[PDB]
Amino acid sequence: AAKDVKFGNDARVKMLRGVNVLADAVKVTLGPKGRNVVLDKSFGAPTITKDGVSVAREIELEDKFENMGAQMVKEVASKANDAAGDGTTTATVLAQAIITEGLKAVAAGMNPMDLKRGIDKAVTAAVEELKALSVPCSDSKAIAQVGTISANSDETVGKLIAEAMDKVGKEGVITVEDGTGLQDELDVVEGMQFDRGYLSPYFINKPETGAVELESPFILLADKKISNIREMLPVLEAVAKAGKPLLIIAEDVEGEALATLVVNTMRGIVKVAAVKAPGFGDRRKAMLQDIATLTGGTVISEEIGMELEKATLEDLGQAKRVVINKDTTTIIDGVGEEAAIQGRVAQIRQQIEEATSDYDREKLQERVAKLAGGVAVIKVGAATEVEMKEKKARVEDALHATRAAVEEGVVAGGGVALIRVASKLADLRGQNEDQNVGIKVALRAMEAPLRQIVLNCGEEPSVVANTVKGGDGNYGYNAATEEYGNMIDMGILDPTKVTRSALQYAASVAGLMITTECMVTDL
Amino acid sequence: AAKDVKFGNDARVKMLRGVNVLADAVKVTLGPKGRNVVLDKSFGAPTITKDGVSVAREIELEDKFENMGAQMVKEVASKANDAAGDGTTTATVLAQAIITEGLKAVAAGMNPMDLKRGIDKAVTAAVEELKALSVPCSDSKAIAQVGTISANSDETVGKLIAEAMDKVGKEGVITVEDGTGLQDELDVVEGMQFDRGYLSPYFINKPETGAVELESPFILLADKKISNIREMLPVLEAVAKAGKPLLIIAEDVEGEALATLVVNTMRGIVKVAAVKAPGFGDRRKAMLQDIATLTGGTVISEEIGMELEKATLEDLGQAKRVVINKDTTTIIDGVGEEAAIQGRVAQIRQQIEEATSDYDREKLQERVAKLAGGVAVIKVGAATEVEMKEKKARVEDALHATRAAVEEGVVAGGGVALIRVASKLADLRGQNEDQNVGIKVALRAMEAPLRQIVLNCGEEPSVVANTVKGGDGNYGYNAATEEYGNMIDMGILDPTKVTRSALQYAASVAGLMITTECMVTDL
Amino acid sequence: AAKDVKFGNDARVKMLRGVNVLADAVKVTLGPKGRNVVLDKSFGAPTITKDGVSVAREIELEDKFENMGAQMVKEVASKANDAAGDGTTTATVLAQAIITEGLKAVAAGMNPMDLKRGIDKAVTAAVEELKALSVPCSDSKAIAQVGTISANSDETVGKLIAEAMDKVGKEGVITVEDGTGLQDELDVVEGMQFDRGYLSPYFINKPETGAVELESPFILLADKKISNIREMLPVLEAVAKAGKPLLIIAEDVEGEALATLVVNTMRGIVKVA
Amino acid sequence: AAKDVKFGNDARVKMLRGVNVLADAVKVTLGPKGRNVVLDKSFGAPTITKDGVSVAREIELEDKFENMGAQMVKEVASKANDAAGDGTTTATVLAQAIITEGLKAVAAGMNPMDLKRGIDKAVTAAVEELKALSVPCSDSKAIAQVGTISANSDETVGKLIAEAMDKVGKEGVITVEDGTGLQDELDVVEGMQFDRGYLSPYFINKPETGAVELESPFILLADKKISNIREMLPVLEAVAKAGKPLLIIAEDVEGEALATLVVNTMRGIVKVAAVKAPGFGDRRKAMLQDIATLTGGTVISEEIGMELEKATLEDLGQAKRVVINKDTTTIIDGVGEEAAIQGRVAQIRQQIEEATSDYDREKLQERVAKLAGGVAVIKVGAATEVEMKEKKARVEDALHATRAAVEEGVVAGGGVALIRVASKLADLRGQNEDQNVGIKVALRAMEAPLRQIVLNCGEEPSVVANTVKGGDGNYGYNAATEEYGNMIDMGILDPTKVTRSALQYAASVAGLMITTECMVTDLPK
């Protein structure tokens, strides 16, 4: 295709206009005074959201160069949300600040590569500073605060997630799903979780979240890979009139002899899914036995001799709900038999007691933790479908923030930690004055979150920025109550991982992206 | 198609406008102060790169004549990257200089093919001069410098590749692949390398790099060609529900009874690849036996009598990663059995000990070198996908540059050695005054790299060119530290092959290219 | 009126277009086999000429840049004409060749004023060499042939110029008049010549001729400046009573007297030169 | 006519476009290797010139904003011309460099007026540095060289002006005239000069010349205001009966008399040129008495009683020639007796002796200087009237540049003065980063003329610039012979005053137009 090619300042200004559009569209959602935005959906109702990443995904400009810049910054939100699930808006704001100031410097005549290297030096120094300043998160009150603040100062969901992590432990799995009443409910039912994903991206359902859900699925388990379609056709055939969608768990699933002809055979009324089995050998076999007992099913093996053609509907497992994601797949509620589940739990506990090898002990302890923790289910209760998915977004963001906080720790909320590390990093210098200018641009950039939150409050940013810079420790500006105080006392806290990942991704993409002079695109 | 035909100066100026667009878009990436570009991608995120040859590949102009010029100079970068993998930007810059000055001479009325002969005489003299001035590369410090400078003065990757060539020797194979952490990692694992390529260009995966990759492939080996599809259908059928993609190694693979119906069978969910077996007869059989033992597989033969229908999933080989390229195909990691691999290594060593024929000894020594060197794997660790591929590009460029340097030698970096050989060639004269002016055009063109690098630094190109021309030996201008000194001492060195190939390709295409009077295109 | 600028090679190719237009339009008629060129007239029949000056006079192009290039070459052609009297086609043909090759060379990237200096040196050498190659024309026969060739190969004109040349010697003065008879009339009468032009171009009675021809005029001789026309009022009254053309020779003529004389000339009451 | 506004960076880029247009159009002809520029005339042949003033005069753009930018740079060029007389191309080239880097820097988000203050500080330091580096031009050989270079490398003109100052000393008054002979003529005749211009621009007989040149006029001296033209009615009648040009010198001229004189001049019935009365009070009256002695005239005053109406042809002064400049009037070969002039010289010398006030003593000293020194006349000699007037113009601006040189000093030409000063000022800093970048913009802009003239040579600007920077003292690049050396040795010099004024007004207009945010203009119609 014939290419329009732009050089230097023209390319950079088209880039920056597109990036400014996207960053405004995302930054209008930041902070407790953050304001939700409407994303058009052609198939259904318009979607309200405070979730930055879905927004940033939805932007696509008409001018090709502006669109390219917007895609480059959409990468920031995508990477940030995948890493942490929160702070994508923060990452985008840090981006926009860094690109704007770096482009001003470059327009002055600056070398962009030295800016890049200075930005890297400053951002790594900031990573070390936040690691020094990170505080462990505990007491179930800090976690509740993280959830509440993450959900736009929603105390009910913060309390609910605090109760959930109290019950299932700091490492238990919690699932957010559609509720039925007007109230959000907690349902900790028996379930299972294994770190595997779908084999083919054609199993993605109508929702664009990337996780496919099954309405009362039918569980099939296997450790030995079958050979021909005809051996597993009767099971499908039985499934084809069982009533319930089929999820198969195997060591590794092909595309040729399953996916192509299940797509060509079925138009998609009732879905069929196939997933990998984590582990290998005896560990995988024991895990499959545990899953089969949880779902009331059985595991086919060469040694047993029981075959797929002999397998019936009652022999195999069944679950009440199953959600499959690329990162990790969970069976939400497998009915099975409660007495059988308890007997298997006792058997695996005695397996722990007899075992003495460190690897065997730790994997069996992982098994008992998975069985005992269960799955917490969040029934998002609200009046409407728009409020359904909006509250789902805020609840999932709160859950992800709590996860990251217990993974790494917490620091002062509202970007105050950025102010403090910027004050601490004022002395960092680069190889030359060029790298010093880059570090100073990064310094100027890290107060962007506070300024943008205060702007979302309608208050003037520079006043608050200087007021916090005059402060120290955990003194900052509660935007919700429009007053200065200690966040740690009042519970405005960010997870350390969220902040660190956001700043890291933003610095990396911005440093690459301000060094760009030739832009080549279709006309 | 109706042809618009342009003659003489208007044709040549449209040509030159297109060439100038492409050459600017490539030359903005040269040197340590070289600055990255953005190439659009329709399927995914925009690609920020410093790789000049890619920049050449995605340039196409709206005016047909300008598009011709751009394509004919894109040929330069393609040929240069194929030959050496670095210096494509240098080749394009030498082109643009030569075409512009030759067009000025032709606009004066000067005869084109005598200019061509003068250019060839000068460029062959320059080849001999650089061969005289080439210095062998060794000590693992010069290699590290070549890698670092090749990767835009990136010292960490230079140290890493120095360690890699220290471990796997100066001739071992090194693979660059996607990493997982934020850090670039070195993983020297057991693998195989053999100079063979894919049979059909329809096996090219989604990446446009031309090398297909397989995630957990399944290895099949053969020395006797099967006859019918039905004999090898069960293996495929077994593969069709094995879980892993199938790579077949054979003497020579057909298209009629494999490729057509394997494209018609699968839609591209899981790939199936077939490659040629290097060598012939007993050498090919021994290589297949070695590869089957490396992957834990077996080789089908008429003498053995074991048949494809009798072959099972456990009988055949399996690898962790395999990347197939047209030039050379490598199995990155075949698990197999470490004890079996060591036993095969000892057996082949004893085969060396018993053998005395020079050809047998050298091929068995090639076998033991391939087995002992293994495969070095570079896990490109970075924050983002854009930084994934950008760091991959710079690391691969460093790899190719180090390969070329150890293949042929090194000279002064930044074109300083090219300046020196230009100074040494001031006395070369052609058959007539026309050829003399052609030689002088080549002479005035060979200072293009230094000028363009210094311009990328934003500095005064003329003072640097004159200062270096006043200098001698390895005295030149470090662009990174903006100062004049000895390149050998400060480690800025080019591979001799890269520079020689760039100048040869550029001179050939440019002299052949400035002779063009008529241009015939679609309207 | 605002001004539109054009700088760079685009301007150069523009006056190149203009000079090519004018230069071809005038070079067609060069030589004895010079082809006719027809020129429109606002009224009546269009004139048909082989005169390079005549065709070169009215060349003026619609767009301003090539018009201005045509005007520069028109300037040099008329300057050579007033310097020499002939060979204007030759001058502008030489101009076309030199400018075309010069613009080709400067567009080829050489230094323009270095080129100009080289051309100046070459043309100076050509000038001195043509002094070396020059041959005296003191003979009346070559005078007859050159007068013939200049006047469109008319031997009668060259012959008459030869006889007049013999009449007034080497540095005499020859003046053309109109004869009522079908034969040309050659005479020698004492007269006065001095290199002085008219105060105003409006004094010319015949615009095509370019000179003021007066028959039996009263001649006034003055060595003083005519600052006021009141000094010329009795002179005008006397010459109007007598009824003949009037010629004035004075040291200087100021704006007032010149303006009043111009007004009187366009009135049609007196003939004053 | 309605008014359209454009504020913000759009206005900035707009006048940047305008100044780039005009600045290139004038920078092409800079230097001895300056390329020709062709300009259309509404009638006849187009003019071809190397004069920066000429090309800069008729630049105006179709759209209003860049036209305005062109007009600011035009007015600064003309202001420097009237201040100095030469180097207008230099001033506007410096203007282009300073404004382009300044607008680039302000568009980079930093404070424009911090930048302007920094540029002002840097240019003030440059002014004091060039004062330090200025060399006296008392030597007649350097005077001949600078007169040569100013008048397009014509050694004859510089030589003639050199002998002119040899005739009338260091601070004498010299007027160029037209000589009928092919040879140049030089004479010295006692005359008058004073800093007074015409009442109306319509008094100028030659619009291209800009001055009123009159031969053998009747001169009227008055110390009173001409409120009514009825006072000038008998004078007009007498001068119309006599038939010569008329000069009026009066204290003030009101609107009525000026309008009536303008009507009379455009009628074509009389030649009347009126100028103000120079000086003030008793000094003005005394020097008007001196002028009356020089021309044989009489001073008319209301306080004395004798009025403008009671004027005869004998009472008015007379002279052989007069030239009334734009703000100056000079009288050559006055009729009045030299003995009376010598007596007046003695009287004002005794006034000097009895003078006690320094101001009055200096006024009497300049009175005796102008009354005794006289005026040199240089009559240009040539064959053609066209080259007559062209060499006359070359003499005019060459001598004006020579006077600028004599008043202040001379430095090596070719812009290397600016190059050396920029070398000596690399160390100065400002109060913040924006003042520092303003200093840097001024520094790297004041080096532009060398690069532009080398461009005009056809060579590479940067190599010559850095080589001359490396060279120290008066070492630089002869553009004429296109080779290095000392320009003093080969006589390539520029007056200190012209370059100093050029850079001063360039920095002034840059500081004023950098700080342009709102740009109002009339509507496109």
Ligand SMILES: Nc1ncnc2c1ncn2[C@@H]1O[C@H](COP(=O)(O)OP(=O)(O)OP(=O)(O)O)[C@@H](O)[C@H]1O
């Ligand atoms: N009362 C408050 N005072 C100060 N900062 C607050 C307050 N409430 C919330 N914040 C800050 O607002 C941010 C949370 O807002 P929000 O969840 O909308 O965006 P995010 O965490 O940057 O990312 P995302 O777009 O994924 O939601 C955190 O930085 C938190 O510290």
Ligand SMILES: Nc1ncnc2c1ncn2[C@@H]1O[C@H](COP(=O)(O)OP(=O)(O)OP(=O)(O)O)[C@@H](O)[C@H]1O
């Ligand atoms: N500090 C430096 N000083 C001088 N030259 C340098 C310096 N750093 C790098 N170079 C030169 O820059 C070039 C490497 O730049 P780069 O890798 O972008 O381009 P390339 O090698 O010409 O080709 P390609 O487009 O394939 O990368 C080499 O010629 C190297 O000598």
Ligand SMILES: Nc1ncnc2c1ncn2[C@@H]1O[C@H](COP(=O)(O)OP(=O)(O)OP(=O)(O)O)[C@@H](O)[C@H]1O
């Ligand atoms: N031989 C020379 N070598 C180098 N520079 C020279 C030489 N002769 C003159 N110059 C420089 O060239 C400039 C003279 O340019 P030019 O004669 O076109 O007019 P100007 O003085 O710049 O201005 P104006 O427009 O008022 O005529 C001066 O800056 C002078 O120093």
